[PDB]
Amino acid sequence: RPNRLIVDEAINEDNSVVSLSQPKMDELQLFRGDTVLLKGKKRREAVCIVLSDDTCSDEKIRMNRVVRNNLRVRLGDVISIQPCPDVKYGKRIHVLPIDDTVEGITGNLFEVYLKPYFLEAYRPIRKGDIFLVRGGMRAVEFKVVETDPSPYCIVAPDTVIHCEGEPIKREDEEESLNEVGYDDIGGCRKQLAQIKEMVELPLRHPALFKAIGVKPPRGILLYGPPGTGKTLIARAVANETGAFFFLINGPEIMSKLAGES
């Protein structure tokens, strides 16, 4: 099946871009700027805009973080990509901010966030997805609850936007944002590559190598001056591969009254 692809870290930080290699476009007759339909796990769905990029391999697809959380998939998994040319201009859009992102704004969100982000963008959206808007000092997420036609539509100047109502409370399987990922680490490319080399395999697929039989690593020492961000590296790795990061502090084990340490 020469349609599926494995997700990978991207460079373009826009919410509606994907990076495919030119042989993939030649094989699938993919142009630039078309609308493609992306299928993933949990029967989730989203749409995006194809952009050219030669850095990624042919079998590899580059995509940002917001779409990755939209599809409920982690890096290293498989998604299905196809051209989706039946999409047409939307009519009305109903958006509602999330509860734990707008604590203390109380202003016209339409003129502040939505108007610049949706300006001359032609961003296609699908009902039920979440997208993040940069702003003044914080980041605000909006979950599109209604669009016409459903489920697909394209932003046009003469579209109705409603930005009024009680903000929707957080979901459960939403994979809450603001958790540190791989974009929050800079200037540590080589060491992060070394760490990812020996930890990805025993954490993503746990049974295969054990069946083969090898000695997986059982301890990694991160040493350096304080403030360089080692806890950040550990938390990012844990939150990306998928694990149960359980920090135990140093002094907290020493402050206990002897016996119970």
Distance from C-alpha of 6 to C-alpha of 113, rounded to nearest angstrom: 33
- The answer to whether residue 254 forms part of the interface with a second copy (CB under 8 A) is no
231 marked ligand binding residue = yes
Q: Minimum distance between the CB of residue 260 and a second copy, rounded to whole angstroms?
A: 11
Write down the residue that tokens 């340490």 correspond to. Answer: 261
Q: Fill in the per-residue mask, 166 to 205: x = in contact with ligand ADP (CB under 6 A), - = not in contact.
A: ------------------xxxx------------------
227 marked ligand binding residue = yes
- The answer to whether residue 104 forms part of the interface with a second copy (CB under 8 A) is yes
End-to-end Cα, the chain, rounded Å: 55
229 marked ligand binding residue = yes
Beta partners for residue 63, in sequence order = 18
Mention every residue, 6+ apart, whose C-beta is less than 8 A from residue 82.
3, 28, 36, 37
Tokens of 185: 């680490």
Query: In the set 210, 216, 220, 245, which binds a second copy (CB under 8 A)?
Result: 210
Q: Which stretch binds ligand ADP (CB under 6 A): 53-61, 75-83, 89-97, 224-232?
A: 224-232
76 marked ligand binding residue = no
Helices (H) and strands (E) in the chain, counts: 8, 12
> Can you give the binding site for ligand ADP, defined by CB under 6 A?
184-187, 226-232
